[PDB]
Amino acid sequence: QEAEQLKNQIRDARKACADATLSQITNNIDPVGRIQMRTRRTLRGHLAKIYAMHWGTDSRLLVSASQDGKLIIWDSYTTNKVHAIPLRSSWVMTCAYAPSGNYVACGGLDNICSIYNLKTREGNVRVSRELAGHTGYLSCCRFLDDNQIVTSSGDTTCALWDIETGQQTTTFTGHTGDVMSLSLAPDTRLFVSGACDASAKLWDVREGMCRQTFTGHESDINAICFFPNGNAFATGSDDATCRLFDLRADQELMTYSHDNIICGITSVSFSKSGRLLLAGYDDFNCNVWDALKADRAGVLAGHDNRVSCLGVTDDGMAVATGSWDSFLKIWN
Amino acid sequence: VEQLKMEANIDRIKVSKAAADLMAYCEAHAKEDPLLTPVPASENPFR
Amino acid sequence: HSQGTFTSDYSKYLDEQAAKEFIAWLMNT
Amino acid sequence: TEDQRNEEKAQREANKKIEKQLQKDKQVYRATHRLLLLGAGIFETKFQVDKVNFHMFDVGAQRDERRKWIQCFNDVTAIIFVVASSSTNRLQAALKLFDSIWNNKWLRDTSVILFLNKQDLLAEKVLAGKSKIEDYFPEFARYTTPEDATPEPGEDPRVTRAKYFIRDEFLRISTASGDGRHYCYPHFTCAVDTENIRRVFNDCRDIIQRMHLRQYELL
Amino acid sequence: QVQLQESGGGLVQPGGSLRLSCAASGFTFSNYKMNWVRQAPGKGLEWVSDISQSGASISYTGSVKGRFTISRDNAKNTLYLQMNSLKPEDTAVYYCARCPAPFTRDCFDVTSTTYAYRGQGTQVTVSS
Amino acid sequence: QVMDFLFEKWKLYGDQCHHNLSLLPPPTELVCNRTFDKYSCWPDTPANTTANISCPWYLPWHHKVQHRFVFKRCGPDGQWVRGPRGQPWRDASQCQMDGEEIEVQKEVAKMYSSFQVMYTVGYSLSLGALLLALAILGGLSKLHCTRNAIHANLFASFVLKASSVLVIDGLLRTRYSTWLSDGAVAGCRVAAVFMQYGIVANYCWLLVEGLYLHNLLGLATLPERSFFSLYLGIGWGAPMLFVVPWAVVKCLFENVQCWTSNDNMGFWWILRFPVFLAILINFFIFVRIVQLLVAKLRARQMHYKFRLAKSTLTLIPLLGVHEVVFAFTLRSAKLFFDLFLSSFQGLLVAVLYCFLNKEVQSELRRRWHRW
């Protein structure tokens, strides 16, 4: 294969820049203390297990998906269902709220991303378009704007679409195994992608080719999320650890791993400033990791089943952690 | 195989100044995170 | 159903137990 | 406040209508039975036996590695497992897949029904020698009929030694690690969708009845 | 980087013996099951054997039971399958295959697709 | 009963003592004086003559023998023999309670109090856990389940039974510790229908739990409609169909000083018929679950069978029947083995279906890991 001279070159490229790491610098940084967060609300009313949720840009309306075939759009302030959409396929696996607020996308095991139109002049909600072309199960779709949606399927492929025509504009291929999650950058020109091969591939939207491939994990990667600066991203896996990678350095920086956690992270998201790193585990908890000293400084233990999704508002005022008990709490 | 060539020609940055980059951004936006520093219950809508 | 049979018997026992109490007033003073 | 009250009431007027629809949908979601039909290595089929709604969700448009999308099927009442007992060596792949479903972290509360298909083609498989049962399972050559359980009439003593050997081969997997509410229901079938839905309904009743007896701690 | 370097293999006369060494580097080796999956030429992938973390439930497929022994060393991060009394039907390429996740008792690694935690594969052959 | 008969007859048959004042001359002229001692009705007699005073039938201790003979002697000016008694007392004491019946007096009062301290420490230990059973099961997040809601109100339907009895034990003794005050007569009757409510509100609520579990297993899936308005209506409404027709028959036909004493058996079977039906139906439900649990244990398991088919058949009849002590005038030991079970039945339902179930043991350990 003649890739050995290319196998060693990046390995010494990571070693030549691995000087004075993040653990050595933040020895002088003061800690944050134990952070008491209590369940402010409890948005009960789902039937089956909540599998995904996404916050609005207005930080008031959150959409949630579950296996019963419903797509509720709650109001987080008043605990009121603004819409309840009857889905076609029951086994949905992700949901996304458009940054304009007009549309909501939800597609799962039926290999089809369905764009719903909540801004319909007629009150009844309806499917705007019905994307198709993927073969595997759909894992995570997110909205760029009201015209472009990039999704992640289980056939080792990410695809960038245009909604008005229903065509794959750009198909991102190069992964091995099922792609599990997705997270857009704040400039929305790049996005990282974690798959079931212990590698989180960073993609370019307007190109279709992997910019850099980061591999420091050792099991299936279940969730990913950018840093607010856009120069880094955390990554949760089934390894029961989180790893804060870096774009400009192309190596891992921290390793958020305690000794007692024998349970894979299913969801991970930063705070508004990125000082905290809220991660949703499989032991029914949400361990808040201080993302600069890698010491756990908080536990959100309200649920009695495993947390599926974990969203943080755009202004940093609340945290919603859905779970498999059909209950979606709103922490603070 | 083309993805492996285009990740080698892009430059790499030492993690000393890359960790101080994330240390500077987390302290320039520290007071505007209303989860790290707790907010009073008057200006908190989830009360 | 022996609970209702008990307190009907316990009250009827305590009823006539007051009858010797009450006849103590008549015979003595 | 009063200008904020009517918009709150209109939000309340939509919430009460939405809560009205969910109570009409909860009593039909909790009344239907979800299934799952996967083989040894159309997406939704709905049938009904004795006024009970069955939702046999059939996967098969997905890929082969199934460690991620089978976690969605933990709330399913029963996972229908159909094997190809005629085989190359599809039987060992069906056995190791059953070991991974039974000992899964999230599927250890979901029972599994078995449908040992390819039945009559196994009768000629033990005589031809293309894929012999002794070639992949040589312990069958010393294994005999386990008990005096009556087989189907019009059969040979060799072929009923074969298919009952496939039965307790799977019962060795299930009875070894019992922790949860899973129960293995083996059956001997030849073709699907002919009298087998009675065998699914009679066994899906026993998962619901054992679910309520577990709630009262009677079992 | 999860990589499973495999050694051994080659041409061995039938009835002889051979030893394979799965050199695993890139993970905590004492936390996962480890399997051996073989691929006969022109046939699909077939599961051969498996071993626990320290080794307590060792199983084999029935065609090679009693002839192959799988052993692991959690201090050297190396997995050994000892071949003995070879048959011509054992002519296959043999893949070391870790299980998907840690501290678990359920693996899904017989898949024909590019499983991510499976080695490159070494080839064993029989002669006349 | 006996007090109701004695108080009227002491005025009615004691009016004959006032009738003695009419026919008798003034007894100061060397005769024996007639005094108002409310027991002696001796007429005028010659001086120094022990007049044999006949016993009246007004005393209720003279049913087997309503006559006695004792001489009543007095002195010069009506000077009867009187010591510590301020009134002139005659010499007649053979008309009291019988010495053969004297063993029933001052000897069984500890035997009732041996049983009286048995169930009231069992009822207070029942509500000592049942009020905590609402704080554990109902007070926490497990409150919206239909199965939990029947178990929650069955706890409240034992608190309604337990707290009504311990009040009516203490209320009945405190009026028994010029006739009695009418402020306690009306309070006793509104606490007796409150106690008789909670008895029927107990047993008929066990009919709810028996009919909920039999319907839950008779179906083929989870139930669509919760039937909760039917079970609240058949459970709290059906005692009001019976204890209110019982009270209005008690109030006019056989009104006495307290509504605990049951004299006529005509309007007592109208308070037993909801209790007797809610055991006979809850036994036919009980034999169906045993017929079901013997089928789920003789198949499809690696059984240990004779243990778990009796370690849960012990866990049933505290939600089911105590009919085995009905077919076994009550023997003192018998009701001692029955009122022990009847009082402690409310405690055991709080032990099994609120503590020992692992649905809350995994929950209470999680809540204690934080606190």
Coordinates of N, CA, C and O in Angstrom, one line a residue, chain A residues 106-245:
Chain A
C106 N -37.5 15.8 10.6 CA -37.5 14.7 11.4 C -37.5 13.4 10.5 O -38.5 13.2 9.7
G107 N -36.5 12.6 10.6 CA -36.4 11.4 9.8 C -35.5 10.4 10.5 O -34.5 10.7 11.1
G108 N -35.9 9.1 10.5 CA -35.3 8.1 11.2 C -35.0 6.8 10.4 O -34.3 6.9 9.4
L109 N -35.6 5.7 10.9 CA -35.2 4.4 10.4 C -35.8 4.1 9.0 O -35.3 3.2 8.3
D110 N -36.7 5.0 8.5 CA -37.4 4.8 7.2 C -36.5 5.4 6.0 O -37.1 5.6 5.0
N111 N -35.2 5.6 6.3 CA -34.3 6.1 5.3 C -34.7 7.4 4.6 O -34.2 7.7 3.5
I112 N -35.5 8.2 5.2 CA -36.2 9.3 4.6 C -36.2 10.5 5.6 O -36.6 10.3 6.7
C113 N -35.7 11.6 5.1 CA -35.7 12.9 5.9 C -37.0 13.7 5.5 O -37.1 14.1 4.3
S114 N -37.9 13.9 6.4 CA -39.1 14.6 6.1 C -39.0 16.0 6.7 O -38.9 16.2 7.9
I115 N -39.2 17.0 5.8 CA -39.2 18.4 6.2 C -40.6 18.8 6.4 O -41.5 18.7 5.5
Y116 N -40.9 19.3 7.6 CA -42.3 19.8 8.0 C -42.4 21.3 8.0 O -41.4 22.0 8.2
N117 N -43.5 21.8 7.6 CA -43.7 23.3 7.4 C -44.6 23.8 8.5 O -45.8 23.6 8.4
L118 N -44.1 24.4 9.6 CA -44.9 24.9 10.7 C -45.4 26.3 10.4 O -46.3 26.8 11.2
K119 N -45.0 26.9 9.3 CA -45.3 28.3 9.0 C -46.5 28.3 8.0 O -46.8 29.4 7.5
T120 N -47.1 27.1 7.8 CA -48.2 27.0 6.8 C -49.3 28.1 7.1 O -49.7 28.2 8.3
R121 N -49.7 28.8 6.1 CA -50.8 29.7 6.2 C -52.0 29.0 6.9 O -52.5 29.5 7.9
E122 N -52.4 27.8 6.3 CA -53.4 27.0 7.0 C -52.8 26.4 8.3 O -51.6 26.0 8.2
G123 N -53.5 26.4 9.4 CA -52.9 25.9 10.6 C -52.4 24.5 10.5 O -51.3 24.3 11.0
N124 N -53.1 23.6 9.9 CA -52.7 22.2 9.8 C -51.3 22.1 9.3 O -51.0 22.7 8.3
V125 N -50.4 21.4 10.0 CA -49.0 21.3 9.6 C -49.0 20.1 8.5 O -49.8 19.3 8.5
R126 N -47.9 20.2 7.7 CA -47.8 19.2 6.6 C -46.4 19.1 6.2 O -45.5 19.8 6.6
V127 N -46.1 18.0 5.4 CA -44.7 17.8 4.9 C -44.4 18.8 3.8 O -45.2 19.0 2.9
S128 N -43.3 19.5 4.0 CA -42.9 20.5 3.0 C -42.3 19.7 1.8 O -42.8 19.7 0.7
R129 N -41.3 18.9 2.0 CA -40.7 18.0 1.1 C -40.4 16.7 1.8 O -40.5 16.6 3.0
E130 N -39.9 15.7 1.0 CA -39.7 14.4 1.5 C -38.4 13.9 0.8 O -38.4 13.3 -0.3
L131 N -37.3 14.0 1.5 CA -36.0 13.7 0.9 C -35.8 12.2 0.9 O -36.2 11.5 1.8
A132 N -35.1 11.7 -0.1 CA -34.8 10.3 -0.3 C -33.6 10.1 -1.1 O -33.2 10.9 -1.9
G133 N -32.9 9.0 -0.9 CA -31.7 8.7 -1.6 C -30.7 7.9 -0.7 O -29.8 7.2 -1.2
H134 N -30.8 8.1 0.6 CA -30.1 7.3 1.5 C -30.6 5.9 1.6 O -31.8 5.7 1.4
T135 N -29.8 5.0 2.0 CA -30.2 3.6 2.2 C -30.2 3.2 3.6 O -31.1 2.4 4.0
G136 N -29.2 3.6 4.4 CA -29.2 3.3 5.8 C -30.1 4.1 6.6 O -30.8 5.0 6.1
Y137 N -30.2 3.8 7.9 CA -31.0 4.6 8.8 C -30.5 6.0 9.0 O -29.3 6.2 9.0
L138 N -31.4 7.0 9.2 CA -30.9 8.3 9.3 C -30.7 8.6 10.8 O -31.5 8.3 11.7
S139 N -29.5 9.2 11.1 CA -29.0 9.3 12.5 C -29.1 10.7 13.0 O -29.5 10.9 14.2
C140 N -28.7 11.7 12.2 CA -28.7 13.1 12.7 C -28.7 14.0 11.5 O -27.8 14.0 10.6
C141 N -29.8 14.9 11.4 CA -29.9 15.9 10.4 C -29.9 17.3 11.1 O -30.5 17.4 12.2
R142 N -29.2 18.3 10.5 CA -29.2 19.6 11.1 C -29.4 20.6 10.0 O -29.2 20.3 8.8
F143 N -29.9 21.8 10.3 CA -30.3 22.8 9.4 C -29.2 23.8 9.2 O -28.7 24.3 10.2
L144 N -28.9 24.1 7.9 CA -28.0 25.2 7.6 C -28.8 26.5 7.5 O -28.5 27.5 8.2
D145 N -29.8 26.5 6.7 CA -30.8 27.6 6.6 C -32.1 27.0 6.1 O -32.3 25.7 6.3
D146 N -33.0 27.8 5.6 CA -34.3 27.2 5.1 C -34.2 26.6 3.7 O -35.2 26.2 3.2
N147 N -33.0 26.5 3.2 CA -32.8 25.8 1.9 C -31.8 24.7 1.9 O -32.0 23.8 1.0
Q148 N -30.9 24.6 2.8 CA -29.9 23.5 2.8 C -30.0 22.8 4.1 O -29.9 23.4 5.2
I149 N -30.1 21.5 4.1 CA -30.0 20.6 5.2 C -29.0 19.5 5.0 O -29.0 18.9 3.9
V150 N -28.1 19.3 5.9 CA -27.1 18.3 5.9 C -27.4 17.2 6.9 O -27.7 17.5 8.1
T151 N -27.5 15.9 6.4 CA -27.9 14.8 7.3 C -26.8 13.8 7.4 O -25.8 13.8 6.7
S152 N -27.0 12.8 8.3 CA -26.1 11.7 8.5 C -26.9 10.4 8.5 O -27.8 10.3 9.4
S153 N -26.5 9.5 7.7 CA -27.2 8.2 7.6 C -26.3 7.1 8.2 O -25.2 7.3 8.7
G154 N -26.8 5.9 8.1 CA -26.1 4.7 8.5 C -25.4 3.9 7.4 O -25.0 2.8 7.6
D155 N -25.3 4.5 6.2 CA -24.6 3.8 5.1 C -23.3 4.5 4.8 O -22.9 4.7 3.6
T156 N -22.6 4.9 5.9 CA -21.2 5.5 5.9 C -21.2 6.8 5.1 O -20.1 7.3 4.7
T157 N -22.3 7.5 4.9 CA -22.4 8.7 4.0 C -23.1 9.8 4.7 O -24.2 9.6 5.3
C158 N -22.6 11.0 4.6 CA -23.3 12.2 4.9 C -23.6 12.9 3.6 O -22.9 12.8 2.6
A159 N -24.8 13.6 3.6 CA -25.3 14.2 2.4 C -25.8 15.6 2.7 O -26.6 15.8 3.6
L160 N -25.4 16.5 1.8 CA -25.9 17.9 1.8 C -27.0 18.1 0.8 O -26.8 17.7 -0.4
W161 N -28.1 18.6 1.2 CA -29.3 18.6 0.3 C -29.7 20.1 0.0 O -29.2 21.0 0.7
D162 N -30.5 20.2 -1.0 CA -31.3 21.4 -1.2 C -32.8 21.0 -1.2 O -33.2 20.1 -1.9
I163 N -33.6 21.7 -0.3 CA -34.9 21.3 0.0 C -35.9 21.5 -1.2 O -36.8 20.7 -1.4
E164 N -35.7 22.6 -1.9 CA -36.7 23.0 -2.9 C -36.7 22.1 -4.1 O -37.7 22.0 -4.8
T165 N -35.6 21.3 -4.4 CA -35.6 20.4 -5.4 C -35.6 18.9 -4.9 O -36.2 18.0 -5.6
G166 N -35.0 18.7 -3.7 CA -35.0 17.3 -3.2 C -33.9 16.5 -3.8 O -34.1 15.3 -4.1
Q167 N -32.7 17.0 -3.9 CA -31.6 16.4 -4.5 C -30.4 16.4 -3.6 O -30.2 17.4 -2.8
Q168 N -29.5 15.4 -3.6 CA -28.3 15.4 -2.9 C -27.3 16.4 -3.7 O -26.8 16.0 -4.7
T169 N -27.1 17.5 -3.1 CA -26.2 18.5 -3.7 C -24.7 18.0 -3.6 O -24.0 18.0 -4.6
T170 N -24.3 17.6 -2.4 CA -23.0 17.1 -2.1 C -23.1 15.9 -1.2 O -23.8 15.9 -0.2
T171 N -22.4 14.8 -1.6 CA -22.4 13.6 -0.8 C -21.0 13.4 -0.2 O -20.0 13.2 -0.9
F172 N -20.9 13.4 1.2 CA -19.7 13.2 1.9 C -19.5 11.7 2.2 O -20.2 11.2 3.0
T173 N -18.5 11.1 1.6 CA -18.2 9.7 1.8 C -16.7 9.6 2.1 O -15.9 10.4 1.8
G174 N -16.4 8.5 2.9 CA -15.1 8.2 3.3 C -15.1 7.6 4.7 O -14.0 7.1 5.2
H175 N -16.2 7.6 5.4 CA -16.3 6.9 6.7 C -16.5 5.4 6.5 O -16.8 4.9 5.4
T176 N -16.2 4.7 7.6 CA -16.4 3.3 7.7 C -17.3 3.0 8.8 O -17.1 3.5 9.9
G177 N -18.4 2.3 8.6 CA -19.4 2.1 9.6 C -20.4 3.2 9.7 O -20.3 4.2 9.0
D178 N -21.3 3.0 10.6 CA -22.5 3.9 10.7 C -22.1 5.2 11.2 O -21.4 5.3 12.3
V179 N -22.5 6.3 10.6 CA -22.4 7.6 11.1 C -23.5 7.9 12.1 O -24.7 7.5 11.8
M180 N -23.2 8.4 13.2 CA -24.1 8.5 14.4 C -24.6 9.9 14.7 O -25.8 10.0 15.0
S181 N -23.8 10.9 14.6 CA -24.2 12.2 15.0 C -23.6 13.3 14.1 O -22.8 13.0 13.2
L182 N -24.0 14.5 14.3 CA -23.6 15.7 13.5 C -23.7 16.9 14.3 O -24.5 17.0 15.2
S183 N -22.8 17.9 14.0 CA -22.8 19.2 14.6 C -22.2 20.2 13.7 O -21.1 20.1 13.3
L184 N -23.0 21.3 13.4 CA -22.5 22.3 12.5 C -21.6 23.3 13.3 O -21.7 23.5 14.5
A185 N -20.6 23.9 12.6 CA -19.8 24.9 13.1 C -20.6 26.3 13.2 O -21.6 26.4 12.5
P186 N -20.1 27.2 14.0 CA -20.8 28.5 14.0 C -20.7 29.3 12.8 O -21.6 30.2 12.5
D187 N -19.7 29.1 12.0 CA -19.6 29.9 10.7 C -20.4 29.1 9.6 O -20.6 29.7 8.5
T188 N -20.8 27.9 9.9 CA -21.6 27.0 9.1 C -21.0 26.7 7.7 O -21.7 26.3 6.8
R189 N -19.6 26.7 7.6 CA -19.0 26.3 6.4 C -18.2 25.0 6.6 O -17.7 24.4 5.6
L190 N -18.1 24.5 7.8 CA -17.5 23.2 8.2 C -18.4 22.5 9.1 O -19.3 23.1 9.7
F191 N -18.3 21.1 9.2 CA -19.0 20.3 10.1 C -18.2 19.1 10.4 O -17.6 18.4 9.5
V192 N -18.1 18.7 11.7 CA -17.5 17.4 12.1 C -18.5 16.3 12.1 O -19.7 16.6 12.1
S193 N -18.0 15.1 12.0 CA -18.9 13.9 11.9 C -18.3 12.7 12.6 O -17.2 12.3 12.2
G194 N -19.0 12.2 13.6 CA -18.5 11.0 14.3 C -19.2 9.8 13.9 O -20.5 9.7 13.9
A195 N -18.5 8.7 13.6 CA -19.0 7.5 13.1 C -18.6 6.3 14.0 O -18.0 6.5 15.0
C196 N -19.0 5.1 13.6 CA -18.7 3.9 14.4 C -17.4 3.3 13.9 O -17.3 2.1 13.6
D197 N -16.3 4.1 13.9 CA -15.0 3.6 13.6 C -13.9 4.3 14.5 O -12.8 4.3 14.1
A198 N -14.3 4.9 15.6 CA -13.5 5.6 16.5 C -12.7 6.8 15.9 O -11.7 7.2 16.3
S199 N -13.3 7.4 14.8 CA -12.7 8.5 14.1 C -13.8 9.5 13.9 O -14.9 9.2 13.4
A200 N -13.5 10.8 14.1 CA -14.4 11.9 13.9 C -13.8 12.7 12.7 O -12.8 13.5 12.9
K201 N -14.5 12.6 11.6 CA -14.0 13.2 10.4 C -14.5 14.6 10.2 O -15.7 14.8 10.3
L202 N -13.6 15.6 10.0 CA -14.0 17.0 9.8 C -14.2 17.2 8.3 O -13.4 16.9 7.5
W203 N -15.4 17.7 7.9 CA -15.8 17.9 6.5 C -15.9 19.3 6.1 O -16.0 20.2 7.0
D204 N -15.8 19.6 4.8 CA -16.1 20.9 4.3 C -17.4 20.8 3.5 O -17.6 19.8 2.7
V205 N -18.2 21.8 3.6 CA -19.6 21.7 3.1 C -19.6 21.9 1.6 O -20.2 21.1 0.9
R206 N -18.8 22.8 1.1 CA -18.8 23.2 -0.3 C -17.8 22.3 -1.1 O -17.6 22.6 -2.3
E207 N -17.2 21.3 -0.5 CA -16.2 20.5 -1.2 C -16.6 19.1 -1.4 O -16.7 18.6 -2.5
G208 N -17.0 18.4 -0.3 CA -17.3 17.0 -0.3 C -16.2 16.0 0.0 O -16.3 14.9 -0.3
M209 N -15.1 16.5 0.7 CA -14.0 15.7 1.0 C -13.5 16.0 2.4 O -13.7 17.1 2.9
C210 N -13.0 15.0 3.1 CA -12.6 15.0 4.5 C -11.4 15.9 4.6 O -10.3 15.7 4.0
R211 N -11.5 17.0 5.4 CA -10.4 17.9 5.6 C -9.4 17.3 6.5 O -8.2 17.1 6.1
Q212 N -9.7 16.9 7.7 CA -8.9 16.2 8.6 C -9.7 15.1 9.3 O -10.9 15.2 9.5
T213 N -9.0 14.0 9.6 CA -9.6 12.9 10.3 C -8.9 12.7 11.7 O -7.7 12.5 11.8
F214 N -9.7 12.9 12.7 CA -9.2 12.8 14.1 C -9.6 11.4 14.7 O -10.8 11.1 14.8
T215 N -8.6 10.7 15.2 CA -8.9 9.4 15.8 C -8.1 9.2 17.0 O -6.9 9.0 17.0
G216 N -8.8 9.3 18.2 CA -8.1 9.1 19.5 C -9.0 8.2 20.4 O -8.6 7.8 21.4
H217 N -10.3 8.0 19.9 CA -11.2 7.1 20.6 C -10.9 5.7 20.3 O -10.0 5.4 19.4
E218 N -11.6 4.8 20.9 CA -11.3 3.4 20.7 C -12.6 2.5 20.6 O -12.6 1.3 20.7
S219 N -13.8 3.2 20.5 CA -15.0 2.5 20.3 C -15.9 3.3 19.4 O -15.5 4.3 18.8
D220 N -17.2 2.9 19.4 CA -18.2 3.7 18.6 C -18.4 5.0 19.1 O -18.7 5.2 20.3
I221 N -18.4 6.1 18.3 CA -18.6 7.4 18.7 C -20.1 7.7 18.5 O -20.7 7.5 17.4
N222 N -20.8 8.1 19.6 CA -22.2 8.2 19.6 C -22.7 9.7 19.5 O -23.9 9.9 19.1
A223 N -21.9 10.7 19.9 CA -22.3 12.0 19.8 C -21.1 13.0 19.6 O -20.0 12.7 20.1
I224 N -21.4 14.1 19.0 CA -20.4 15.1 18.8 C -21.0 16.5 18.9 O -22.2 16.7 18.8
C225 N -20.2 17.5 19.2 CA -20.6 18.9 19.3 C -19.4 19.8 19.2 O -18.4 19.5 19.8
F226 N -19.6 20.9 18.5 CA -18.5 21.9 18.4 C -18.4 22.7 19.7 O -19.3 22.8 20.5
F227 N -17.2 23.4 19.8 CA -16.9 24.4 20.7 C -17.5 25.7 20.2 O -17.7 25.9 18.9
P228 N -17.9 26.7 21.0 CA -18.4 28.0 20.6 C -17.4 28.8 19.7 O -17.8 29.6 18.9
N229 N -16.1 28.6 20.0 CA -15.1 29.3 19.2 C -15.0 28.7 17.7 O -14.6 29.4 16.8
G230 N -15.3 27.5 17.6 CA -15.2 26.8 16.3 C -13.9 26.2 16.0 O -13.7 25.7 14.9
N231 N -12.9 26.3 16.9 CA -11.6 25.8 16.7 C -11.4 24.5 17.4 O -10.3 23.9 17.4
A232 N -12.4 23.9 17.9 CA -12.4 22.6 18.7 C -13.7 22.0 18.7 O -14.7 22.6 18.3
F233 N -13.8 20.7 19.1 CA -15.1 20.0 19.3 C -14.8 18.9 20.3 O -13.8 18.2 20.2
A234 N -15.8 18.7 21.2 CA -15.8 17.5 22.0 C -16.4 16.3 21.3 O -16.9 16.5 20.2
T235 N -16.3 15.1 21.8 CA -16.7 13.9 21.2 C -17.0 12.9 22.2 O -16.1 12.5 23.0
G236 N -18.3 12.4 22.3 CA -18.6 11.3 23.2 C -18.7 10.0 22.4 O -19.0 10.0 21.2
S237 N -18.4 8.9 23.1 CA -18.4 7.6 22.5 C -19.0 6.6 23.4 O -19.6 6.9 24.4
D238 N -18.8 5.3 23.1 CA -19.1 4.2 23.9 C -18.0 3.7 24.7 O -18.1 2.7 25.4
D239 N -16.9 4.5 24.7 CA -15.7 4.2 25.5 C -15.8 4.7 27.0 O -14.9 4.5 27.7
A240 N -16.9 5.3 27.3 CA -17.2 6.0 28.6 C -16.1 7.1 28.8 O -15.6 7.2 30.0
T241 N -15.8 7.8 27.8 CA -14.9 9.0 27.9 C -15.3 10.0 26.9 O -16.0 9.7 25.9
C242 N -15.0 11.3 27.1 CA -15.1 12.3 26.2 C -13.7 12.9 25.9 O -12.8 12.9 26.7
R243 N -13.5 13.3 24.6 CA -12.2 13.8 24.2 C -12.4 15.1 23.5 O -13.1 15.2 22.5
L244 N -11.8 16.2 24.0 CA -11.8 17.5 23.3 C -10.7 17.5 22.3 O -9.5 17.7 22.6
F245 N -11.1 17.4 21.0 CA -10.1 17.4 19.9 C -9.8 18.9 19.5 O -10.3 19.8 20.2

